[PDB]
Design a protein around this ligand. Structure first.
Ligand code: ZN
Ligand code: ZN
Ligand code: ZN
Ligand code: ZN
Lengths: 222, 25
């Protein structure tokens, strides 16, 4: 079983995407049915989604962090791998999915990869994969070696300006005024420009979050 | 009313925000 502090991937069952995570605790629950193995529950924190906090996860939704990249030339059809895709904008970078390679081709213009991409619901067949050099071998149970040297991956939603670095201020990511990431619960989101504002950084400030439908910032006439 | 925390939780919404922000004008 995966150890405490072990860097791992964790699968968001709503969307099928895999996410860098770190094991915080391991709870071993006893089986409901005879001849069934004990149920390992992993409590995990997300590397770049700490806001979610520690989450309970089933051992099927957790596997050893992805370490090895398979090279273009080494990819063959039928292979199941983890690769990047964006269901909102396939040209642009997105999230990390498990997919079965369906078509591989090399034109004079560029190298093309297609795979069936597993999402929350089901597959998505013969998708045009564009990050062709960032195709990860899925770490198989049993084989490998604990990752206690994190192999980070470039993920879709990053900020161009602060690179999501939590030790930098940013007036894009975070509060538009101070650029601070603290008390995000007390940061109103403009319903027009989608900018964030601490309640206390507003002038005049607010003591708590308004209970109305929409909220606009000053610039957006409020 | 919507908060940054509620966004930062939803990985899609998080990403969708960034685009709305960067490609606006
Ligand atoms: Zn930023
Ligand atoms: Zn502020
Ligand atoms: Zn605004
Ligand atoms: Zn910008």
């Amino acid at each position: 079983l995966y150890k405490v502090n072990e860097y791992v991937d964790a699968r968001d069952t709503n969307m099928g995407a895999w996410f860098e995570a770190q094991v915080v605790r391991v709870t071993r629950k006893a089986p409901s049915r005879p001849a069934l193995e004990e149920d390992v529950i992993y409590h995990v924190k997300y590397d770049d989604y700490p806001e979610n906090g520690v989450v309970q996860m089933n051992s099927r939704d957790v596997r050893a962090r992805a370490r090895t990249i398979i090279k273009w030339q080494d990819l063959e059809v039928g292979q199941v791998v983890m690769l990047n895709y964006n269901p909102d904008n396939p040209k642009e970078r997105g999230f990390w999915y498990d997919a079965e390679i369906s078509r591989k081709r090399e034109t004079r213009t560029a190298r093309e990869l297609y795979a069936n991409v597993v999402l929350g619901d089901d597959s998505l067949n013969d998708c045009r994969i564009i990050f062709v050099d960032e195709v990860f071998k899925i770490e198989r149970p049993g084989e490998g070696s604990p990752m206690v040297n994190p192999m980070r991956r470039k993920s879709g939603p990053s900020c161009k300006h602060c690179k999501d670095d939590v030790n930098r201020l940013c007036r894009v990511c975070a509060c538009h005024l101070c650029g601070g990431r603290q008390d995000p619960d007390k940061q109103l989101m403009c319903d027009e420009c989608d900018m964030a504002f601490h309640i206390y950084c507003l002038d005049p400030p607010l003591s708590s979050v308004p209970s109305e439908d929409e909220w606009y910032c000053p610039e957006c006439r409020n | 009313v919507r908060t940054l925390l509620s966004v930062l939780k939803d990985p899609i919404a998080k990403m969708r925000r960034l685009v709305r922000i960067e490609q606006r004008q």
